[PDB]
Amino acid sequence: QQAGTNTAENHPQLQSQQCTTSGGCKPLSTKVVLDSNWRWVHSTSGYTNCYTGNEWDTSLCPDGKTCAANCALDGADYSGTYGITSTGTALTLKFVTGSNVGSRVYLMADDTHYQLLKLLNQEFTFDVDMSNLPCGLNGALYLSAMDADGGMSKYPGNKAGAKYGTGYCDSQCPKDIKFINGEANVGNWTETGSNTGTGSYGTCCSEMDIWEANNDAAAFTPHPCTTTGQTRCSGDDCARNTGLCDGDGCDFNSFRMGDKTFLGKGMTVDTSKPFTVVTQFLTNDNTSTGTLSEIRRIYIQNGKVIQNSVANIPGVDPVNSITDNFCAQQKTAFGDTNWFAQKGGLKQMGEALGNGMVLALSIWDDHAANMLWLDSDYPTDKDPSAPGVARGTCATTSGVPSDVESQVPNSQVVFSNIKFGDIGSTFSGTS
Ligand SMILES: OC[C@H]1O[C@@H](O[C@H]2[C@H](O)[C@@H](O)[C@H](O)O[C@@H]2CO)[C@H](O)[C@@H](O)[C@@H]1O
Numbered sequence: 001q002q003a004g005t006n007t008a009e010n011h012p013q014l015q016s017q018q019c020t021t022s023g024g025c026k027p028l029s030t031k032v033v034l035d036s037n038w039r040w041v042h043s044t045s046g047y048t049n050c051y052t053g054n055e056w057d058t059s060l061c062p063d064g065k066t067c068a069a070n071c072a073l074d075g076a077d078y079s080g081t082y083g084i085t086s087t088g089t090a091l092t093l094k095f096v097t098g099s100n101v102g103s104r105v106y107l108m109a110d111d112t113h114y115q116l117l118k119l120l121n122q123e124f125t126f127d128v129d130m131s132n133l134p135c136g137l138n139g140a141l142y143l144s145a146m147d148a149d150g151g152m153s154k155y156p157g158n159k160a161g162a163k164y165g166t167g168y169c170d171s172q173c174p175k176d177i178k179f180i181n182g183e184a185n186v187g188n189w190t191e192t193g194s195n196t197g198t199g200s201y202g203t204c205c206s207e208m209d210i211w212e213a214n215n216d217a218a219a220f221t222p223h224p225c226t227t228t229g230q231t232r233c234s235g236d237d238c239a240r241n242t243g244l245c246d247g248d249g250c251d252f253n254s255f256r257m258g259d260k261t262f263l264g265k266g267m268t269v270d271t272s273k274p275f276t277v278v279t280q281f282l283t284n285d286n287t288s289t290g291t292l293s294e295i296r297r298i299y300i301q302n303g304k305v306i307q308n309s310v311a312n313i314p315g316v317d318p319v320n321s322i323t324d325n326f327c328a329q330q331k332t333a334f335g336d337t338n339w340f341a342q343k344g345g346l347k348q349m350g351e352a353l354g355n356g357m358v359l360a361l362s363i364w365d366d367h368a369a370n371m372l373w374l375d376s377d378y379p380t381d382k383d384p385s386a387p388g389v390a391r392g393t394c395a396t397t398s399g400v401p402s403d404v405e406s407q408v409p410n411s412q413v414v415f416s417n418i419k420f421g422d423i424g425s426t427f428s429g430t431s
C-alpha cells in the first residue's frame with residue numbers, strides 16, 4: 001500500500017521504561033500506531049475509497065499488485081474516530097466509537113519503526129484497569145514477530161510501513177488482513193461481517209499473549225510457529241493448528257486450572273480495581289542465549305505481592321508457571337492435542353523472543369467464538385463438568401458481538417506504566 005497525505009498521521013505518545021539491576025529504570029519516548037486494517041484506504045490520486053464497508057473497488061483493485069499501487073493508507077483521528085487516547089503514560093482504548101468497533105495499536109520506537117523487544121532472560125510489567133471491561137470483551141497486550149519496518153524492506157509494494165501500522169501477523173494466520181507482503185489480499189474476497197472480510201492469503205508468525213482478559217477471566221499464552229518471522233500462507237499452511245502455527249497455544253487461566261476464587265471482582269486479584277501484572281521469561285542458564293524454560297507471573301495490588309495461582313486439576317502437577325511439562329500435562333487432562341510441542345514448544349517460542357518482537361495493545365469482541373474460550377464454558381459441545389471446559393463464570397449466551405456492541409458500547413480498558421528489563425528490576429519489595 002502507498003502512504004496517503006490527506007490526513008496527517010500523529011502518533012500518540014506512550015512512554016515506557018527500560019530497567020536494569022544496577023541502573024534502575026530509565027524512560028523511553030515511545031509512541032503508538034493504529035493497525036493498517038482500521039484505516040481509510042483510498043486512491044493515491046484523490047479521495048475515492050479503495051475499500052468501503054466489507055468490499056473492495058473492483059476498478060481500482062482488480063488484483064493485489066494493482067491495488068497496492070493504486071491505493072493508499074491515510075492518517076487517523078485517534079480519539080475521534082477510534083476512541084484511542086493517551087495521557088502520555090496511560091493508554092485508554094474504548095470499545096465502540098460511532099460505527100467503529102475496537103482497535104489495535106503497536107508500540108513505536110520512533111515515527112517509522114516499531115519498538116523491537118528482546119525479552120529472553122528479561123521481564124515485562126504493566127498496569128491494567130478492567131473495571132469497565134465486562135464479559136464478552138478482551139483487552140489484550142501481546143507480542144508478535146513482525147518486522148520493525150512493517151515489511152517495507154522485504155516488499156516493494158509496501159511504501160507505507162510501520163508509520164501506518166502495516167505488517168501484522170499472528171499465530172492464527174488470519175486471512176482478514178487487507179495488505180500482506182505489499183499486496184492487497186483481494187483474491188476470492190469473502191464478506192464475513194458488515195466491515196470485514198477475508199482473502200486468499202493469511203499472515204502467520206509466532207505470538208506471545210502476555211495478557212488476554214476481562215473483569216471475569218484472564219489468560220496468558222505462548223503460540224510458537226515453525227517459521228521464522230512474518231510469512232504469507234495459502235491453503236493448508238493457513239489451517240489452524242495443523243498448519244505452520246500453534247493457534248491454541250499453551251494457556252494458563254487460573255479459573256480453568258482450578259482456582260475459581262483467585263481473579264475476578266472482589267477476589268485475590270480484584271478486577272474491580274487497577275493492578276500490576278509482571279511476566280518473566282526465564283532461560284535454562286540465566287543468559288540471553290539460553291533456551292526459554294519457564295514463564296512466570298506475579299501480580300501486585302495495593303502494594304501486596306501476589307504469587308500466581310496453583311494448578312488444581314487431577315493429573316496435572318500443582319505448579320504456577322508455564323513450562324513444557326505443564327503444557328504436556330494440561331493438554332492431557334483437558335483432552336486437547338499438544339500442537340504447542342509439535343511446533344517446538346518453549347524452545348521455539350524463545351527463538352522468536354530472541355529475535356525481537358513487536359508489542360500490540362487491543363480491545364476487541366469475537367465473532368467466531370464469542371469470547372467463550374476466555375470467560376465461559378468452551379467448547380460448547382463438551383460437558384461443562386469435564387476438566388478444562390469451564391473458563392469463567394460468564395453465561396454461554398454472552399459475547400455475541402451484536403449484543404455487546406449495543407449493550408455495553410462505552411466499555412474500555414486502560415493500560416499503563418509499561419516497563420521492561422532485567423529480571424527482578426521492574427519492581428521492588430521491602431519489609
Ligand atoms: O479460537 C478461539 C481461541 O482459542 C483458544 O484456544 C482454545 C481452543 O480453541 C480450545 O479447543 C481449547 O479447549 O482451549 C484453548 C484455550 O482457550 C486460543 O488460545 C485463543 O487464542 C483463541 O482466540
Ligand SMILES: *[C@@H]1O[C@H](CO)[C@@H](O)[C@H](O)[C@H]1NC(C)=O
Binds near residue numbers: 285286
Ligand atoms: C538461574 O536463576 C535462578 C533464579 O530464578 C536460580 O534458581 C538458578 O540457580 C540460576 N541458575 C544458574 C545456572 O545460575
